[PDB]
RNA sequence: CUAAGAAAUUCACGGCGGGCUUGAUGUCCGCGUCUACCUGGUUCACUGCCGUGUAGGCAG
């Protein structure tokens, strides 16, 4: 994708800036479920995997307009106090890229016990014996703590970036911005 | 290279029998506890779907 554009997350003493990125994701992901499509993607250009942090950047790329249309829609209203904006231009060359995927895991072993005794008809302890309780996979990914509106349930989504590689290849994007196969240059 | 260097305590047993502790009592006057605070630190690791699958992803 040509153009991107980074918003930085304004430190402020009233909110921590994971807050602010939490809430800053969940209004991109509103506002992506409300215009749709899936070439438009996201990056994080201040990782740090030692620690685990996101840091205070976000990189959104798409094309031209659509960076220009949603700089004027109210899912910026309410928060421009909060952020300072970019300038949407061109990625430099030359950039290696990689990926955003959402990685999930089992660490709820309840869940697993409802899938196989709803499916299957078991009884509580054919379901502790199947599945035991070391099923729980640790993580050292940075996450996203949002909410739900309708049903309102608030989870963290863990964000993995992908290797690095030479040359970028087509695919999809989620409501969410992480990557189906599409990749998003690194710099 | 140590006041070094060494070592088998052990066999057996009936402590019990008896008893009145009692009478009497004023705790009591008095008291300024105050001043000021972000519960969030991502702190709700959730809910459902495709998939035979626990393999892998998805949707909010």
Request: with cysteine.
């Amino acid at each position: 994708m040509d153009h991107y554009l980074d918003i930085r997350l304004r430190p402020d003493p009233e909110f921590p800036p994971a807050q602010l990125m939490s809430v800053l994701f969940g209004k991109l992901h509103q506002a992506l479920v409300a215009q749709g499509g899936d070439r438009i993607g996201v990056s994080f250009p201040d990782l740090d995997e030692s620690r685990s942090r996101l840091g205070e950047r976000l990189r959104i790329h798409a094309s031209a307009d659509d960076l220009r249309a949603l700089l004027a829609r109210p899912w910026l209203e309410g928060l421009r106090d909060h952020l300072q904006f970019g300038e949407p231009a061109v990625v430099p060359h030359p950039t290696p890229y990689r990926q955003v995927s959402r990685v999930q895991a089992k660490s709820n072993p309840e869940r697993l016990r409802r899938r196989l005794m709803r499916r299957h008809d078991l009884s509580e302890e054919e379901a502790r014996k199947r599945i035991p309780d070391t099923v729980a996979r640790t993580l050292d990914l940075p996450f996203v703590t949002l909410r739900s509106q309708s049903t309102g349930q608030h989870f963290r989504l863990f964000i993995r970036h992908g290797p690095l590689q030479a040359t970028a290849e087509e695919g999809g994007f989620t409501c969410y911005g992480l990557s189906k196969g599409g990749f998003v240059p690194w710099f």
